[PDB]
Each structure stands twice: as C-alpha cells, then as structure tokens.
Structure 1
C-alpha cells in the first residue's frame, strides 16, 4: 500500500477526538490560540504515528 491502514485508522481516531475537543472548547469559550495549539498537537501525533 501507498498508505498504512493502521496510521489511517489513527487519523480517523484523531479526527474524531479533534471534533470532540473542539465541541468542548467552543462549549467552554476557549481562546482560538489554545484551540489551534491542541489541533496542532493532534496533527503532530498523526505524523509521528505515520
């Protein structure tokens, strides 16, 4: 495969958690900067995992 199915699975997991944390952060009125930083952290986890 061009793409590792395990890594792609981790991408879907991180996508799900991303919209989860997002929904929470908008619920709790988080500053956009901190939100962007958690998202960046998740993308980093995806790369590391790949």
Structure 2
C-alpha cells in the first residue's frame, strides 16, 4: 500500500484512481483469507 500510495502522489493523480487501487489491494485480502484455510490444511498434507 505505502509503495503505490507514494507513487501515485508523485504524479499527483486522482483521489478516486488511488483509492480504487487500494480498495482492490484489500479485496485481495478478503479473497486470500477464504482460501488460506484450505491451502494450509489440505494442500500442505499433499506436499508432505
């Protein structure tokens, strides 16, 4: 977040074009949290 936030203000682009990036970054949080249970419980025994 802090890398793309400092990069967008270097080119002083829109508030909406920067927040819609950061709403997408923590949408990847929500999609990661739903699949992180099934990787560490069921993919981890397959690699074992």
TM-score (norm 1): 0.64
Partners in 1 of 2:13 and 2:29 — Cα distance? 23
TM-score (norm 2): 0.66
Mark the structure with the bigger radius of gyration: 2
- Greater length-normalized contact order (CA 8 Å, ≥ 6 residues apart): 1
1:8-28 Cα offsets, whole Å, 9 max, x none, are: xxxxxxxxxx11000000001
Count of residue correspondences:
33
- The one of 29, 33, 39 aligned to 2:12: 29
